RNA sequence: UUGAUUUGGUGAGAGG
DNA sequence: CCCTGTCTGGCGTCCTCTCACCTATGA
DNA sequence: TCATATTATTACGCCAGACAGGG
């Protein structure tokens, strides 16, 4: 069964693997994030309720009044989205917050408040999201791009090689909170443990232990195990568990029980450990040279004399043993400092520590954190107890506590947001364990260690900034509060919240202007994962590994769609099936595989879960039950693609599109292209302009439907039914009764957005693709947007392309185009320019909007009214007048009248005017005369534009040939576009050839149907040929149910197929070559894909037959009459005497540094002298040169450049006396 | 090395158009240094003929007529 | 200056000077009032820090800032840096009489001239047109001439063709690395908006035609026109200054046209007929009586200059082809016939132009470079040298080689289950057998491409080098190598993960067969590393050129 | 073909000729005789 | 025209010889009109007249007496680029 | 004597 | 007193194009 | 409108160059 615009033109779908999970809604990141931000969600998480339950109830410092919270709300926007874009306002909503002030008496923690008051106060306006995932910030339509940042929670990083210049590794450990102070632990090459807070000075780390009220003995209890020396009959014997001797040299005689176990000289093996455990050896008598290097654990005091024997962490000598033996402390606890495993790092750090108690530890930490200003008991204790341990200024979130408990192998995952003693001690213990050998480091590119921020999280953080500023203001007003003469808007202020949230949505590194020239480009700018932004890395610094693809990107981030240039791999784009985890990580679908039978249930995993399991490959042959047809299958275990058994796997990939994104899964024959050319192909495919006549890719992938629907450029029907079709203004849909509400009788009236400006000056336009009185279903499309054709996605157009060299006109990457491409207007795109004119009151009275234009004669009053402003629609070009806008006293009158820029033509499509109340409306103040004029240039195609296919084959269209000179085959049809075969062996993008052959076969079927329907046959022969065309070959998913198309839906389908039968070649499970040959045999075309072609010039055959087919070629928006520029003489800058830069400023070319070196490389001394003195800078030289040229005397009078005298005055404006010496 | 050798030149404009200008201008200022131009980039700065190419005859003439 | 609006966008130095003057006025008033010691110490200290912030901001502790947190730019920051006065306004300047547009090919050009659009030509040459218009007497004042070219009447295009004629222009591609990236041409006017640039010259500019842009500069004075014609003309730059190798080497289409032209096949039309000259060789090719590659005795007259500057004619019968005689009609007099008697790939045509330059000098080498380019484009058009899906011939021996390698890794892993061998020796044995199987697959496809054609002549079969399209694009040296044609037919090797170590399971599928998912992902590892390396390598390459031209 | 002329700047063409191929360059038992 | 460029330290007598007037007030401009400040950073007497050969305030609107400085203007009378060198 | 403001500076994206 | 970690400064590619956004205070 | 004058984040990678520490 199919829907009714699905039976219009059903695309022949190759593809063998049955898909189990349909594609999710492609804008779900933006929409789910912002629906989390604004939603009335009780239990508090997450949203605006989390912000209000953190900041409220505010109580002042015993001021006996406590403003509390009830509920919030967002009213209607005063401006709907269209008139909001037209006017220039934000698309926002007012945030109505109920606030309940209760005020206490004296001595009421428990007492009832003396008075209440409550009102629905107004704080800020928050910008709502449009239904397509965009904002409208100040007239312009912007997009917040989801960030990719390091997760909160501990990270054990190594930095193995570069420091110390000696090959000795370090090991640092960063506890990254979501909000607050950063705590890092780090070794130094003396093997001492150092703490630093917020990248400040370096403190030896155990001082933080001494700041947590730990004595030295408790610290040595934590990080060391005790070895017991018992004072006995002679020589102070030792308790010896045999584990401690692992891998060391026997220094003494190892004997017990009257038996010599191990003699001196040999190392202790594990067999000797087994001998000591079998022989039950604990107590052995040691020599006095064994204790002469060990370190005491706890303190001991001489009992009778009443003084100290030795402090804790003191090494022992023989006379120290003579001190402690004669006193009466029989047990001696020593620190086992194994050189192999259990290193003495804490103990040597305690030897570095200049402190002894808790108070001096806090004084040293306070002198680290805030220097100069004195360290007193209260101040240092409040500092250190609010560094990590208060809920205000330090908060690992739920993500942070999950990562923090997971990296320490804790059992639980939910806990308190602050740290504790035990958490810092566990981070130090795991760091020491990593130094000892057990456990390993973490990598930072691993996407289980890399969280995503999105729109709701970022706006919530900015809103929390605004709320803590307004609670500091409420605490300000309340202690100065007199009662009862205030109601809660003398306390609260709507200004800081609105200021902060408009600061983020207006001027941030991620709230950025939407790439809007294409439905693909909208839908792939909204699905973007940037590594940049606040708190993340920068473009010009890092690095090599964060720019590189890591094995956790499989199914989370597209491997091949990343922009080339200065930021590669920082601006990653999200995969097709990848959702976002509850904690913000990237979870991708897999199919749960209990045993041999691969089950059709799906189950989502992130990269810290994908490593443990064994996950299969998407295309592994399984037949009729889910059993893998082989006994061994390629899977990947822990980021390592390896071959495993038939019955070991726990998950399988869902579908074979899932590695790549929605930009680079629209490329058919992706698997035959190179990776580089797929990258260039996807990045150029974002850049296509919408043509005037949208044209249905013959070789698509079937993902065109989901992109063209899910990006909101088409008018998808909300409720199904029939149609009334007034449509000149709006589609009117009568609703079927089952989908129709009992009250609100109701018929749906869709607004078509006609010719208007996009963000990239292209033309967004919707056209109805349903007739009058025609059934439509829910979810069906009604109006085709820009670059769409019956709900599919038509960026460029499909044209007949020959691969051959043609007389040099397609030399490096150029492209030679017939005249049939430019006669049919099949790339003639439509651009729209907005031009503003204002008549602000700068000085000497206000400016004026009158046709009575001066000096200039009846060449002003022309495309305007009888007395002012461009009339409505003519063919205006360059140098015309649109809005007469000139003042008197500015003879002394002048011409600021906004005219048409140089080089452009067009038709005035619209004139908007919300001018200074007097022009003879709704807008803001200040600005007076506000006249916006919308031109619409129609640019065709010309030598110099840029076209490209989908595979990375760029081209600048070189010669626009006549129809006659084209290479025609023996049937008579010219070929449209000639490309060059030499690009194909080097640039290994062989997929464009299979697209060429399969598009040739598609139009072969289209020509066959066009013959069977033009030379008109009764519909039995058409339905037989359509059935043969839709069966065609191997086991596929489509077949068709064609005998249920009522003898008319066969004919309407065959009316929509006579331009070529559309073929879906999916991404990695595409059409094989034998099916291309078999489809080329169904059409009457030659099997090789190659036709003999004659030459239009000479009429004689090209030897060695050439390839002709249909490639889907796109017109990119790098048009040549936006790049052509020239300057002889005009205006310059102010500070310098050199020319201005750019095209919108009529400026000249920067003759840079390497061009000066290139002229020095020749003998061009005079060319360089005029290149930097006369042509550029020296004012007397250039006026004398212009007069010398127009007299007919090519001679320069050089002089000295002006910018060098600017250099002299800037150097001389220091204390520097730079001069110019003798004649 | 090449950056230490181009910053240690007897012509401070040649060593100031290149890397750090603060160090070189204070060294030249407190030394009272003087720049007998005599190279390519001093004459690209000060706006005259290069003493290499076509301008080598001009600089022969000017060096002869002193 | 104020921007568009009603407020003044003030510079940073005005903030610095205004603070120094505010503080200095405060300090004069406090020394008037006789404030105590600590007040005037803080006042003089704030003046010291204000002066020190004015001169070189940020050399003291954290730099002052106006809007919003960004520090404001001081005098020393008007001097130093990439954007000071030296590197931004004195070494490199913006320049009048200059233009910029997208380039395109135009292969009809001679290599001393380039195409230049009429709109750019009328804008860059406004003063010369004004001077020409004032000389004829058509107008009077300068205003009249500016109205005439603002209207663009019918008489200023003849004025424009009379100011262009012998006036060179400097074309310049935007990353100029060596001196061959600024070359002077003569304009030929173009209906259009794109600079037509002669193709051979592209190999000097590193200019393809995938969206490139170039700038045009006009030599104004008379010494600069003579420097553009006598030093910087494109005919004068035919050897690269880094070495002795010619830089006007024919790049890609033209070597395919020559390699298809001067070749042979064991039977064609007109096999072994005898021809009285190269003129009737081209007449037999055009009329349709012989083929472009058909071996034939011709009578050619090569001029060897064995005396002291005297050209001696020797005429003989060379057993050659039809295409070699047709290409002999273009070779100048002094070169011997054996420069065209071979197959003429890219190294051979480069040494052809090099021997022409060493013997016959500059002017025959310029005109012969143009005739090479014209005949290469013309017979590459006549060749019809496409690329198909059938041209990438899969080896029949490829699947058995992969199964023998799979049996070998099976033997090594069965030893690994029983622990006979070590892990590093296992990894080394797997990388060694996949390197050996890769070399065997490459030799299988290379035999299957380099001699696949087997055609008979008058009897039993006889083999020859193939006319496969991808093999001529590889063997000619136009575009392609052994590795790229290897990856389109044989297996594409053992790609390496970004750890730097290689991956033990290779990519056994080429591009004509489909890569599955994991193999493409390993491929993307290997290619993302290359794009990151180029896009970060270019900064160090440019900074190295800067340090080198400032030590020189 | 001839010797360098009196004047032609050789330092700049040399520095450009060394630094210009900077893009093409990469960034990141006993003796057995062969001939006789 | 000139040989070598000499760089040296700037003596206070040398800085007073460069100068044309002490910049006292920090007041940049009027900002509500168009006039500057007399006598602030952007002065008249210390540097020069904004307009070419005009007293900014009011006298000399032709080409006869280029130089006169009345008490009502406290302004020099030269070119528009004269302030760039002063 | 016949007319006028971006360069300034930041951020984001793109081309070769 | 000659090695020595450690800290502080100083580099980090040219050319071009599009868009938006710009200090608070205040009797 | 017309003078008043500066604070609560961290996450580069060498590579010279100068400095207090100690055998
Ligand atoms: Mg290119
Ligand atoms: Zn006056």
From Swiss-Prot, chain A:
Job of this protein: DNA-dependent RNA polymerase catalyzes the transcription of DNA into RNA using the four ribonucleoside triphosphates as substrates.
GO terms for MF: DNA binding; DNA-directed RNA polymerase activity; ribonucleoside binding
Pfam families documented for this protein: RNA_pol_Rpb2_1 (PF04563), RNA_pol_Rpb2_2 (PF04561), RNA_pol_Rpb2_3 (PF04565), RNA_pol_Rpb2_45 (PF10385), RNA_pol_Rpb2_6 (PF00562), RNA_pol_Rpb2_7 (PF04560)
Top EC class, one word: transferase
PROSITE patterns: RNA_POL_BETA
Keywords annotated in UniProt: Acetylation, DNA-directed RNA polymerase, Nucleotidyltransferase, Transcription, Transferase
Organism: Escherichia coli O157:H7
Subunit structure comment from the entry: The RNAP catalytic core consists of 2 alpha, 1 beta, 1 beta' and 1 omega subunit. When a sigma factor is associated with the core the holoenzyme is formed, which can initiate transcription.
GO BP terms in the entry: DNA-templated transcription
List of residues that carry N6-acetyllysine: 1081
EC code(s) of this entry: 2.7.7.6
Signal sequence interval, chain numbering: none
Designated name of the protein: DNA-directed RNA polymerase subunit beta
Catalytic activity: RNA(n) + a ribonucleoside 5'-triphosphate = RNA(n+1) + diphosphate
Family stated for the protein in its record: Belongs to the RNA polymerase beta chain family.
Domain of life: Bacteria
Keyword Transcription: yes
One GO cellular component term noted in the UniProt record for this chain: DNA-directed RNA polymerase complex
């Amino acid at each position: 069964v199919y829907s009714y615009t699905e039976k219009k033109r059903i695309r022949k779908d190759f593809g063998k693997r049955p898909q189990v999970l349909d594609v999710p809604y492609l804008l779900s990141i933006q929409l789910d994030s912002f629906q989390k931000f604004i939603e009335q969600d009780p239990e508090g998480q997450y949203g605006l309720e989390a912000a209000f339950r953190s900041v409220f109830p505010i109580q002042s410092y015993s001021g006996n009044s406590e403003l509390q919270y009830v509920s919030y709300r967002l009213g209607e926007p005063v401006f709907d989205v269209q008139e909001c874009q037209i006017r220039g306002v934000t698309y926002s909503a007012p945030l109505r917050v109920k606030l309940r002030l209760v005020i206490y008496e004296r001595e009421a923690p428990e007492g009832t408040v003396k008075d209440i008051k409550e009102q629905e106060v107004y704080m800020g306006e928050i910008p709502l999201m449009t239904d397509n995932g965009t904002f409208v910030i100040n007239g312009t339509e912007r997009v917040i791009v989801s960030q990719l940042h390091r997760s909160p929670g501990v990270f054990f990083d190594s930095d193995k090689g570069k420091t110390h210049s000696s090959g000795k590794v370090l090991y640092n450990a960063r506890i990254i909170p979501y909000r607050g102070s950063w705590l890092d632990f780090e070794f130094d090459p003396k093997d001492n443990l150092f703490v630093r807070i917020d990248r400040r000075r370096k403190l030896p780390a155990t001082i933080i232990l001494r700041a947590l009220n730990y004595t030295t003995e408790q610290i040595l209890d934590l990080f060391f195990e005790k070895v017991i020396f018992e004072i006995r009959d002679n020589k102070l014997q030792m308790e010896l568990v045999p584990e401690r001797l692992r891998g060391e040299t026997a220094s003494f005689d190892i004997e017990a029980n009257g038996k010599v176990y191990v003699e001196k000289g040999r190392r202790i093996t594990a067999r000797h450990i087994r001998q000591l455990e079998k022989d039950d050896v604990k107590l052995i008598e040691v020599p006095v040279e064994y204790i002469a290097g060990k370190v005491v654990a706890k303190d001991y005091i001489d009992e009778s004399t009443g003084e100290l024997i030795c402090a804790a962490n003191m090494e022992l000598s023989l006379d120290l043993l003579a001190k402690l033996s004669q006193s009466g402390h029989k047990r001696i606890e020593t620190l086992f400092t194994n050189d192999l495993d259990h290193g003495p790092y804490i103990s040597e750090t305690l030897r570095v520590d200049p402190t002894n108690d808790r108070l001096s530890a806090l004084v040293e930490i306070y002198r680290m954190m805030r220097p100069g200003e004195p360290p007193t008991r209260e101040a240092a204790e409040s500092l250190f107890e609010n560094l990590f341990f208060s809920e205000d200024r330090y908060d690992l979130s739920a993500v942070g506590r999950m990562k923090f408990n997971r990296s320490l192998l804790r059992e639980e995952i939910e806990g308190s947001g602050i740290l504790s003693k035990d958490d810092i001690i566990d981070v130090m213990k795991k760091l020491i364990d990593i130094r000892n050998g057990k456990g390993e480091v973490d990598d930072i590119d691993h996407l289980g260690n890399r969280r995503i921020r999105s729109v709701g999280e970022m706006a919530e953080n900015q809103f929390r900034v605004g709320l803590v500023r307004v609670e500091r203001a409420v605490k300000e007003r309340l202690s100065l509060g007199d009662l009862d003469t205030l109601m809660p808007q003398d306390m609260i202020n709507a200004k800081p919240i609105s200021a902060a949230v408009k600061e983020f949505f207006g001027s941030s590194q991620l709230s950025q202007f939407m790439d809007q020239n294409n439905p693909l480009s909208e839908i792939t700018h909204k699905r973007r994962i940037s590594a940049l932004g606040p708190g993340g890395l920068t473009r010009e610094r890092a690095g090599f590994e964060v720019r590189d693809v890591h094995p956790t990107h499989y199914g989370r981030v597209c491997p091949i769609e990343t922009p080339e240039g200065p930021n590669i791999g920082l601006i990653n784009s999200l995969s097709v099936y990848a959702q976002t985890n509850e904690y913000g990580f990237l979870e991708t679908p897999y199919r749960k595989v209990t045993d041999g039978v691969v089950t059709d249930e799906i189950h989502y995993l992130s990269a810290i879960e994908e490593g443990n399991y064994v996950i299969a490959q998407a295309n592994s042959n399984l037949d009729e039950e889910g059993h893998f047809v082989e006994d061994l299958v390629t899977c990947r275990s822990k980021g390592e693609s390896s071959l495993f058994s038939r019955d070991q796997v726990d998950y399988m990939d869902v579908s074979t599109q899932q590695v790549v994104s929605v930009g680079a899964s629209l490329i058919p024959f992706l698997e035959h292209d190179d990776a580089n050319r797929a990258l260039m192909g996807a990045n150029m495919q974002r850049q296509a302009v919408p043509t005037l006549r949208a044209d249905k890719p013959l070789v698509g992938t079937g993902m065109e439907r989901a992109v063209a629907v899910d990006s909101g450029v088409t008018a998808v029907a909300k409720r199904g039914g029939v149609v009334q079709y007034v449509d000149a203004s709006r589609i009117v849909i009568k609703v079927n009764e089952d989908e129709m509400y009992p009250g609100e009788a109701g018929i749906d009236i869709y607004n078509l957005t006609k010719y208007t400006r996009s963000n990239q000056n292209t033309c967004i336009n919707q056209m109805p693709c349903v007739s009058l009185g025609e059934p439509v279903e829910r979810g069906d499309v009604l109006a085709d947007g820009p670059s769409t054709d019956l709900g599919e996605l038509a960026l460029g157009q499909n044209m007949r392309v020959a691969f051959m060299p043609w007389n040099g006109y397609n030399f490096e990457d150029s492209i030679l185009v017939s005249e049939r491409v430019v006669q049919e207007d099949r790339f003639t795109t439509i651009h729209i320019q907005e031009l503003a004119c204002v008549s602000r009151d700068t000085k000497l009275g206000p400016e004026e909007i009158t046709a009575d234009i001066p000096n200039v004669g009846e060449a002003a009053l022309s495309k305007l009214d009888e007395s002012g402003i461009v009339y409505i629609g003519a063919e205006v070009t360059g140098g015309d007048i649109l809005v007469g806008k000139v003042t008197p006293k500015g003879s002394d009158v002048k011409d600021s009248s906004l005219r048409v820029p140089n080089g452009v033509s067009g038709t005035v499509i619209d004139v908007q005017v919300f001018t200074r109340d007097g022009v003879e409306d709704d807008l803001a103040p200040g600005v007076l005369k506000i006249v916006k004029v919308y031109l619409a240039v129609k640019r065709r195609i010309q030598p110099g534009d840029k076209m490209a296919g989908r595979h990375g084959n760029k081209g600048v269209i070189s010669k626009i040939n006549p129809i006659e000179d084209m290479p025609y085959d023996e049937n008579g049809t010219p070929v449209d576009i000639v490309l060059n075969p030499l690009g194909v062996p080097s640039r290994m993008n062989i997929g464009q050839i299979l697209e060429t052959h399969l598009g040739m076969a598609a139009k072969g079927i289209g020509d066959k149907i066009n013959a069977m329907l033009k030379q008109q046959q009764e519909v039995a022969k058409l339905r037989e040929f359509i059935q043969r065309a839709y069966d065609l070959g191997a086991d596929v998913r489509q077949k068709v149910d064609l005998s249920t198309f009522s003898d008319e839906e066969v004919m309407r389908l065959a009316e929509n197929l006579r331009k070529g039968m559309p073929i879906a070649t999916p991404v990695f499970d595409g059409a094989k070559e034998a099916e291309i040959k078999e489809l080329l045999k169904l059409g009457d075309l030659p099997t090789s894909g190659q036709i003999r072609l004659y030459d239009g010039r000479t009429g004689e055959q090209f030897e060695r037959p050439v390839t002709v087919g249909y490639m889907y070629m796109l017109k990119l928006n790098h048009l040549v009459d936006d790049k052509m520029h020239a300057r002889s003489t005009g205006s310059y800058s102010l500070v310098t005497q050199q020319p201005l830069g750019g095209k919108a400023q009529f400026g000249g070319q920067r003759f840079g540094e390497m061009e000066v070196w290139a002229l020095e490389a020749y003998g061009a001394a005079y060319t360089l002298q005029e290149m930097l003195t006369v042509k550029s800078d020296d004012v007397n030289g250039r006026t004398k040169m212009y007069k010398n040229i127009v007299d007919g005397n090519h001679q320069m009078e050089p002089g000295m450049p002006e910018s060098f005298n600017v250099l002299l005055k800037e150097i001389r404006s220091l204390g520097i006396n730079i001069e110019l010496e003798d004649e | 090395g090449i950056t230490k050798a181009s910053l240690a030149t007897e012509s401070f404009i040649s060593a100031a158009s290149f890397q750090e200008t603060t160090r070189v201008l204070t060294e030249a200022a407190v030394a009272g240094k003087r720049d007998e131009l005599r190279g390519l980039k001093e004459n690209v700065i000060v706006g005259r003929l290069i003493p290499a190419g076509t301008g080598y005859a001009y600089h022969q003439d000017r060096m002869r007529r002193r | 200056v104020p921007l568009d609006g009603g407020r003044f966008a003030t510079s940073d130095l005005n903030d610095l000077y205004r603070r120094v003057i505010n503080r200095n006025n405060r300090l004069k008033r406090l020394l008037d009032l006789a404030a105590p010691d600590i007040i005037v110490r803080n006042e003089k200290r704030m003046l010291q820090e204000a002066v020190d912030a004015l001169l070189d901001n940020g050399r003291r502790g954290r730099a002052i800032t106006g809007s919003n947190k960004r520090p404001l730019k001081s005098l020393a920051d008007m001097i130093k840096g990439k954007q000071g006065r030296f590197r931004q306004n004195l070494l490199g300047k913006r320049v009048d009489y200059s233009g910029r547009s997208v380039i395109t090919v135009g292969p009809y050009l001679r290599l001393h001239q380039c195409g230049l659009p009429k709109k750019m030509a009328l804008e860059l040459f406004k003063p010369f047109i004004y001077g020409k218009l004032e000389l004829r007497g058509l107008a009077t004042t300068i205003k009249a001439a500016k109205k005439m070219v603002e209207r663009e009447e019918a008489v200023v295009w003849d004025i424009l063709d009379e100011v262009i004629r012998e006036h060179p222009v400097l074309l310049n591609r935007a990353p100029t690395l060596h001196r061959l990236g600024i070359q002077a041409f003569e304009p030929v006017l173009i209906e259009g908006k794109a600079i037509q640039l002669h193709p051979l010259v592209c190999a000097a500019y590193n200019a393809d035609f995938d969206g490139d842009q170039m700038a045009v500069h006009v030599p104004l004075t008379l010494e600069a026109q003579l420097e553009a014609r006598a030093l910087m003309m494109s005919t004068n730059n035919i050897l690269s200054p880094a070495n002795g190798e010619p830089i006007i080497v024919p790049s890609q289409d033209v070597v395919l046209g020559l390699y298809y032209m001067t070749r042979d096949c064991v039977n064609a039309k007109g096999e072994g007929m005898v021809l009285t000259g190269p003129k009737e060789a081209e007449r037999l090719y055009r009329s349709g009586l012989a083929s472009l590659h058909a071996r034939v005795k011709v009578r050619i007259t090569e001029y060897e200059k064995d005396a002291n500057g005297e050209l001696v004619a020797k005429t003989s019968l060379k057993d050659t082809t039809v295409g070699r005689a047709i290409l002999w009609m273009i070779v100048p007099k002094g070169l011997p016939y054996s420069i065209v008697n071979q197959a003429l790939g890219k190294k051979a045509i480069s040494k052809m132009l090099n021997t022409c330059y060493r013997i016959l000098g500059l002017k025959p080498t310029v005109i012969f470079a143009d005739q090479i380019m014209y005949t290469g484009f013309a017979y590459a058009a006549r060749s019809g040298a496409s690329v198909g899906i059938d041209d990438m011939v899969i080896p029949e021996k490829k699947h058995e080689i992969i199964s023998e390698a799979e049996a070998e890794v099976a033997e090594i892993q069965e030893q690994f289950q029983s622990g006979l061998v070590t892990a590093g020796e296992r990894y080394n044995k797997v990388i060694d057998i996949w390197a050996a199987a890769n070399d065997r697959v490459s030799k299988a496809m290379m035999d299957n491409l380099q001699t696949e054609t087997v055609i008979n002549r008058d009897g039993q079969e006889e083999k020859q080098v193939s006319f496969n399209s991808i093999y001529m694009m590889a063997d000619s040296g136009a575009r392609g190598s052994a590795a790229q044609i290897r990856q389109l037919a044989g297996m594409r090797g053992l790609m390496a993960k970004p750890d730097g170590s290689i991956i033990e399971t290779p990519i056994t599928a080429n591009f004509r067969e489909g890569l599955n998912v994991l193999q493409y992902f390993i491929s993307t590892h290997g290619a993302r590393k290359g794009l990151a390396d180029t896009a970060l390598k270019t900064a160090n390459s440019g900074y190295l050129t800067r340090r080198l031209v400032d030590v020189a | 073909g001839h010797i360098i002329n009196k004047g032609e700047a050789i330092g700049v063409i040399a520095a450009q000729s060394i630094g210009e191929p900077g893009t093409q360059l990469t960034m990141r038992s006993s003796i057995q005789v062969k001939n006789k | 025209e000139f040989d070598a460029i000499k760089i040296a330290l700037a003596s206070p007598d040398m800085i007073r010889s460069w100068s044309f007037g002490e910049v006292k007030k920090p007041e940049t401009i009027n900002y509500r009109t168009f006039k500057p400040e007399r006598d602030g950073l952007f002065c008249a007497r210390i540097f020069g007249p904004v307009k070419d050969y005009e007293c900014l305030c009011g006298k000399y609107k032709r080409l006869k007496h280029r130089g006169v400085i009345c008490e009502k203007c406290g302004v020099e009378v030269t070119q528009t680029k004269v302030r760039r060198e002063r």
